[PDB]
C-alpha cells in the first residue's frame, strides 16, 4: 500500500455503506437417516480366490507287469590258453 | 534290466482336420501343450482340389 499526501486514502470505508440484506442465516439442518434394507449373505462372481495354473507339470500313473522268461544261444567252448 | 524313460514316453503320430479358411486371412492351427512336436504335415484339401 501507498498513501499519498495531500491526496490521502480515505481512512476507512465509512458509515455511508448500504446494508443490503439481513439474509445471513443458515438454518441448521435437522435430519434422521435410515439405510435398512435386508442384506443377504452372498454375492455371485465368476471367480474369486483362485490362483489358476499358468502351466501344469507333466503328471502320470504307473504300471508294470510280467514274468522272467527267455530263449538263449551260448558261445562255443574254446581251448584254454594259460593257467 | 530296463530303460524306463523310453518306455514311459510315447512316440505317436496323430491326425486332425480343421476348417474355416478365408482368402488372405491367417488360418492358425494351435499346437497343444505337453507334446513335443517333431514334425507337422498340413494338407490343403481345397474343396477336392489339390
| Resolution reading in Å | 4.2
Angle A69-A74-A77 (CA atoms, 0-180°, nearest 5)? 155
What grid cell was written down for A51? 490362483
Which residue in this structure is represented by grid cell 507337422?
B40
Whether the Cβ atoms of residue B24 and residue B30 lie closer than 8 Å to each other: no
Beta bridge partners of B10: none
Residues of A in contact with B34 (CB under 8 A): 58
**B8 contacts: CB under 8 Å, gap ≥ 6:** A60, A62
User: CA-CA distance, B50 to B47, in Å (whole number)?
Assistant: 8
- Spell out which residues of chain B touch residue A60, defining contact as CB-CB under 8 Å: 8
In chain B, the largest separation of any two C-alpha atoms, in whole Å, equals 57
- Contact between residue B31 and residue B37 where contact means Cβ atoms under 8 Å apart: yes
Distance to chain B for A83, nearest Cα, Å:
34
Cβ <8 Å between B34 and A58: yes
- Continuous segment of H or E residues that includes residue B5: helix B4-7
Cα A53 off chain centre by: 19
Which residues face B14 on adjacent strands?
Answer: none
Taking the CA of residue A51 as centre, how many other CA atoms within 13 Å lie in the half-sphere pointing to its CB? 0
Amino acid at each position: 500500500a501507498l498513501i499519498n499526501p495531500q491526496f490521502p486514502y480515505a481512512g476507512p470505508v465509512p458509515i455511508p455503506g448500504p446494508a443490503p440484506t439481513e439474509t445471513m442465516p443458515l438454518l441448521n439442518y435437522r435430519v434422521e437417516g435410515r439405510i435398512a434394507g435386508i442384506q443377504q449373505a452372498r454375492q455371485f462372481m465368476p471367480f474369486l480366490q483362485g490362483p489358476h495354473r499358468a502351466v501344469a507339470e507333466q503328471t502320470y500313473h504307473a504300471i508294470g507287469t510280467g514274468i522272467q522268461m527267455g530263449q538263449t544261444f551260448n558261445q562255443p567252448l574254446i581251448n584254454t590258453q594259460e593257467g | 534290466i530296463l530303460p524306463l524313460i523310453d518306455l514311459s514316453t510315447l512316440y505317436n503320430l496323430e491326425n486332425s482336420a480343421q476348417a474355416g479358411l478365408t482368402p488372405n486371412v491367417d488360418f492358425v492351427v494351435q499346437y497343444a501343450n505337453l507334446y513335443r512336436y517333431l514334425s507337422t504335415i498340413a494338407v490343403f484339401d481345397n474343396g477336392g482340389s489339390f
